[PDB]
């Protein structure tokens, strides 16, 4: 899925950062990976939409952490 | 302490709405509690600032899940 690999894309960016705050976003993304697969199994469309939105917020927080 | 009590306040709202998406937000809130305590111990102000922004993203996502007729 394009969800997991974009989430894995951001995970590697978080490991690039090598700061505690980036490690927090790394843990949240791995939970999202597991949650999205569950949401896909039960046909939970609203959970998918929220997780997809959270994916964009994580990417924006990584970018803020990267700039600083 | 202000952050944890907001997060515990959000955790209780998530548990009341009884859907898989709530428990995901619940687990993320519990991680943020632990991470915020570590940020306070280390004096990591940037991590603190992003965690309180994350806490605000929690409230909006929870308000979205709660919005139900």
Identify how the structure was determined. X-ray
CB atoms within 10 A of CB B20: 13
Query: Resolution reached, in Å?
Result: 2.2
Element counts in chain A: helices (H) and strands (E): 3, 0
Taking contacts as CB-CB distances below 8 angstroms, the residues of chain B near A47 are 19-21, 24
Distances (CA, A) of A42 to A47, A53, B60: 10, 19, 24
d(CA A28, CA B29): 10
DSSP classification of residue A42: T
Residues of A with CB under 8 A from a CB of B: 19-21, 24, 27-28, 31-32, 35, 38-39, 42, 44, 46-47, 50-51, 53-54, 57, 61, 64-65, 68
Name the nearest CA neighbour of A25 among A50, A8, A48.
A8
* Residues A24, B44: C-beta atoms closer than 8 Å: no
CA distance B46 to chain A (A): 8
A35, B24 contact by CB (below 8 A): yes
Measured between alpha carbons, how far is A54 from A50 in angstroms, rounded to an integer? 6
Candidates A67, A68, A7; CA nearest to A35 is A7
Please answer whether residues A52 and A10 qualify as being in contact, where contact means their C-beta atoms are separated by less than 8 angstroms. Answer: no
């Amino acid at each position: 899925g394009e969800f997991e690999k974009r989430a894995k894309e951001l995970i590697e960016r978080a490991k690039k950062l090598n700061t505690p705050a980036a490690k927090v976003i790394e843990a949240a993304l791995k939970l999202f990976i597991e949650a999205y697969a569950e949401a896909k199994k039960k046909g939970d469309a609203l959970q998918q939409k929220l997780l997809e939105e959270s994916l964009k917020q994580a990417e924006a927080m990584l970018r803020r952490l990267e700039h600083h």
